[PDB]
Amino acid sequence: MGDCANANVYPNWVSKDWAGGQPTHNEAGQSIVYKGNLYTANWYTASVPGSDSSWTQVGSCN
Numbered sequence: 001m002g003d004c005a006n007a008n009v010y011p012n013w014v015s016k017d018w019a020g021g022q023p024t025h026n027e028a029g030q031s032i033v034y035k036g037n038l039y040t041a042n043w044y045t046a047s048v049p050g051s052d053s054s055w056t057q058v059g060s061c062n
Contacts, residue, residue: 004033004061010049036060 003009013023014030025046026032032039034049038059045054 003035004038007061008032010034011046013046031058033061036062 008014008031010032011023013026013032015027016022016024025044026041026049028041028043030041032041032049037050037057038061039049039055040058042054042056047053047055049055050057
């Protein structure tokens with residue numbers, strides 16, 4: 001049903017810039033899921049995982 005199941009489903013970003021801040025984006029090496037497919041940010045981005053920007057597909061949850 002969910003994009004992964006219960007992982008970091010976009011826009012459940014990994015960070016704000018720092019850990020404690022409510023998120024704002026995914027940084028270099030930080031992964032996320034977007035409709036089955038798993039992606040990782042190349043540098044810094046908050047677009048749509050897979051829509052170029054700074055994304056790179058690492059796999060798929062489901």
